[PDB]
């Protein structure tokens, strides 16, 4: 005979990382609203991470970002046009610089969503990491308004949580956005308000910064008569609610017994 | 020693079928405009394939569709609501029925794109099949207009052919659409006008047909005060231009030496 239940040639089954799944659903969701996804460098200049986003030196707004400062000689940190950029080096504290980046290299109107690994000098506990992921949004063009920001988030929420879901917007402060705002989503099987991310209408001084950088690069102004809305949305938090993960520290851990648990998901 | 160029354990490399690639790029393209993809049955009723699309019996418009008629006893052909449907059975001559299908089961506004295998009694040569694939579009809702149909196609063309591309619209006749139209795209590296598919503003008698079927099913009217645009776009043709395939007969052929040639593509 040939015992037909007898285990077969055990080949390797691959899998994706929790964050990858979550990042994916995220971009998939936004690309159906016409957002295209681009990435940026993890090692950034202070000019892109801070100055171009209206976060100035010795300003009390920089305390929202506990920053890793890097040193090192002979390291080409390439700018939006591949030009060699100078400036005091650091690790991205948010993906936000990518939108100054992108705006210099392209022209309105556009929709983009940018994922990335981001860094903060913070104490690794169970609901906090020193290294985690953000997903940015930027929609710039003539006529764009805050109604469209709300619309986007409303759309995000509908897709991540179903019809029984609703979104909440509250004023809050970011230097690179005014009117600024924090947004929360209502998740039915939890009866809970999720603080998801921050957002707003991209700040006049940001547009100014990019058009200025443009000139230095010899490019034409492109952001004098357009408006925009950006948002920043933290991904681990969201992945935790979705896959039911009790501890953020797991993501960076390497535990196969952990990773393997996600082979199924789609 | 250990000769390190010496071929390694030869494992199996998989691949996708030319049509699958083309179907995919297609849906990917349209899902970024907010179209969602649904499918329909390959075995259809005359009511869905013809009557509900304003293609009546012994009408000279049915000659655009050389049809396979099926016979057979004890075969549940399930309708939009899973209800057992009756009617003279055939093979889909186009994917178009799917939009009557969908409209009965859902309510406006929506964007859908429907791929499918479709059949025609025709002589298998090099630029013709008896079995090939179509990709349908349907965008229905308040305010929808022909400008939006053109916009869609313009968008399709931009993405399949680059900026140097342009689209051409000419009046043409379909019973399920008026104003009706054929559309062609301009493909630069070919200096050629591609006749891609047909389209138009979904016909008043179609909306009427679905709302009528709805009543029979006990559902409420949903298409009295909405407009719509559909399009039908043949996929093999497009795949042939893209992957450079000289002969449609290859798609249904099974030649590994042929299929294997497409493992790379993305
Ligand atoms: N980048 C910000 C989030 C953010 C706020 C407002 C806006 C935006 O696009 C993004 C953060 O690190 O929390
Ligand atoms: N279904 C039609 C094509 C078509 C025409 C007009 C409209 C539409 O949505 C689709 C065909 O078989 O060629």
Curated annotation (Swiss-Prot), chains A, B:
It catalyses: tRNA(Phe) + L-phenylalanine + ATP = L-phenylalanyl-tRNA(Phe) + AMP + diphosphate + H(+). The keyword Metal-binding applies. It is an enzyme of class 6 (ligase). Mg(2+) binds at residue 178. Keywords: Aminoacyl-tRNA synthetase, ATP-binding, Cytoplasm, Ligase, Magnesium, Metal-binding, Nucleotide-binding, Protein biosynthesis. Its cofactor is Mg(2+). This is Phenylalanine--tRNA ligase alpha subunit. It comes from Thermus thermophilus. The lineage of its organism: Bacteria, Thermotogati, Deinococcota, Deinococci, Thermales. The gene is pheS. The chain holds residues 85 to 350 of 350 of the full protein.
């Amino acid at each position: 005979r040939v015992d037909v239940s007898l285990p077969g040639a055990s080949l390797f089954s691959g899998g994706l990382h929790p964050i990858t799944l979550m990042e994916r659903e995220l971009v998939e969701i936004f690309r159906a609203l016409g957002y295209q996804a681009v990435e940026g460098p993890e090692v950034e200049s202070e000019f892109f991470n801070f100055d171009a986003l209206n976060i100035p030196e010795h300003h009390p707004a920089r305390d929202m970002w506990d920053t890793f400062w890097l040193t090192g000689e002979g390291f080409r940190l390439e700018g939006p046009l591949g030009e060699e950029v100078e400036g005091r080096l650091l690790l991205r504290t948010h993906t936000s610089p990518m939108q100054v980046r992108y705006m210099v290299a392209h022209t309105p109107p556009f929709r983009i969503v940018v994922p990335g690994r981001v860094f903060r000098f913070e104490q690794t506990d169970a609901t906090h990491e020193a290294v985690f992921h953000q997903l940015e949004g930027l929609v710039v063009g003539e006529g764009i308004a805050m109604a469209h920001l709300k619309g986007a988030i409303y759309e995000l929420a509908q897709a991540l949580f179903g019809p029984d879901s609703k979104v909440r917007f509250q004023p809050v402060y970011f230097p690179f956005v005014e009117p600024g705002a924090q947004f929360a989503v209502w998740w039915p099987e939890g009866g809970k308000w999720l603080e998801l991310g921050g957002a707003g209408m991209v700040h006049p001084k940001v547009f100014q910064a990019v058009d200025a950088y443009r000139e230095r690069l010899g490019l034409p102004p492109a952001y004098r008569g357009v408006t925009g809305f950006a948002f920043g949305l933290g991904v681990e938090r969201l992945a935790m609610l979705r896959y039911g993960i009790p501890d953020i520290r797991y993501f960076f851990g390497g535990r196969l017994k952990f990773l393997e648990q996600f082979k199924g998901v789609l």
